[PDB]
Design a binder for this molecule. Structure first.
Ligand SMILES: Nc1ccn([C@H]2C[C@H](O)[C@@H](COP(=O)(O)NP(=O)(O)OP(=O)(O)O)O2)c(=O)n1
Ligand SMILES: [Cl-]
Ligand SMILES: [Cl-]
Ligand SMILES: [Cl-]
Ligand SMILES: [Mg+2]
Ligand SMILES: [Mg+2]
Ligand code: NA
Length: 326
DNA sequence: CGGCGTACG
DNA sequence: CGTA
DNA sequence: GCCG
């Protein structure tokens, strides 16, 4: 079991679901308190269990596994022995955890804003609606659309949605392409949003594309909310039987030279990409982002024609998107 | 003990 | 600050 | 919280 999540296959569904979900509760709570280090450890420990070939049935099977120390092991031990971890349950039902989760789920609200509201005594969504003066335009849209945005986006919604984006993209720049990325590319059947990566086969032709795409989508009456730019975080009108629902849609443009790096980054998972960039820098001395891979000694960028190229340049066995569910 | 990913809006 |  |  290698120490980095990018060094091992992680399938979407696995054999330790209950154990990973408990550790990710503690990771989430750590983030609500600003403890990024503890969040990472609990996330990594959870991911290790996702990568195991069978269920953990005894504590001894944790020996030698990376990122399992006294704390994470005690969590697993109690779940194995009693089916419940007291610390996890105490977090679950705490007013702090429940409210920070409720607030951070709002589009436009992060940990710092939710914490401030919590210290001010706010606890419910209606508490926020009553004092709308303290809300950004982004937060007003997230709060108004919160109910729809809390329902999972279905894979069966995605194809129809990709078609309307492609139509706007094709008018904005003939020859431009739309690629489904994010969780759905990793095989997820549901998602919190839909993530689309846009490019054009002729390097440079994609410059200035996203404003033209957004203007056409808005002209179609499809944009319920959006803010030179290359990333757009929108709220889209998705048809439903006799009606419609609001859905979150992310659009990002990249030049074809950077497409493999953008596809890799936007396909995730989030933990997988953090681990991959950490591996790149700490183990290989290379700097990785969604734009390229930089050698700081030669001061050169590595050209990539595919995701496979990138895995090879980092000395990692290739993992298909379905095995990046860290 | 230092480090914990790295961007854009 | 928010966002991926 | 854990690794190196
Ligand atoms: N902080 C973040 C957020 C996202 N990302 C990347 C990897 C994610 O898979 C991808 C898409 O972000 P995302 O839409 O918020 N999450 P994802 O699509 O994987 O699952 P959903 O929650 O959307 O169902 O961007 C990242 O690298 N760092
Ligand atoms: Cl911490
Ligand atoms: Cl270069
Ligand atoms: Cl990036
Ligand atoms: Mg997504
Ligand atoms: Mg997204
Ligand atoms: Na939020």
């Amino acid at each position: 079991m290698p120490a980095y999540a990018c060094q091992r296959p992680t399938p979407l569904t696995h054999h330790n679901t209950g154990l990973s979900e408990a550790l990710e509760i503690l990771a989430e709570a750590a983030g609500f308190e600003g403890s990024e280090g503890r969040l990472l450890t609990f996330c990594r420990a959870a991911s290790v269990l996702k990568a195991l070939p069978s269920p953990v049935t005894t504590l001894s099977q944790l020996q030698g596994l990376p990122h399992f120390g006294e704390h994470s092991s005690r969590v697993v031990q109690e779940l194995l022995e009693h089916g419940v971890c007291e610390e996890v349950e105490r977090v679950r039902r705490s007013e702090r955890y429940q409210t920070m989760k409720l607030f951070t789920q709002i589009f436009g609200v992060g940990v710092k804003t939710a914490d401030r509201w919590y210290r001010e005594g706010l606890r419910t969504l209606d508490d926020l609606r009553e004092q709308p003066q303290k809300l950004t335009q982004q937060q007003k849209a997230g709060l108004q659309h919160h109910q729809d945005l809390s329902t999972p986006v279905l894979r069966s919604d995605v194809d129809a949605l990709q078609q309307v984006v492609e139509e706007a993209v094709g008018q904005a720049l003939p020859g431009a392409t739309v690629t489904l990325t994010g969780g759905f590319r990793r095989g997820k059947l549901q998602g919190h949003d839909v993530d689309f990566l846009i490019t054009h086969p002729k390097e440079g032709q994609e410059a200035g594309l996203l404003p033209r795409v957004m203007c056409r989508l808005q002209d179609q009456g499809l944009i319920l909310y959006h803010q030179a730019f290359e990333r757009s975080f929108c709220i889209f009108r998705l048809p439903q039987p006799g009606s419609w629902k609001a859905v979150r849609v992310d659009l990002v443009v990249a030049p074809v030279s950077q497409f493999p790096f953008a596809l890799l980054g936007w396909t995730g998972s989030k933990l997988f990409q953090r681990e991959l960039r950490r591996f790149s820098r700490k183990e290989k001395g290379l700097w990785l982002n969604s734009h390229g891979l930089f050698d700081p000694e030669q001061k050169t960028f590595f050209q990539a024609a595919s995701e496979e190229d990138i895995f090879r340049h980092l000395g990692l066995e290739y993992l298909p998107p379905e095995q990046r569910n860290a």
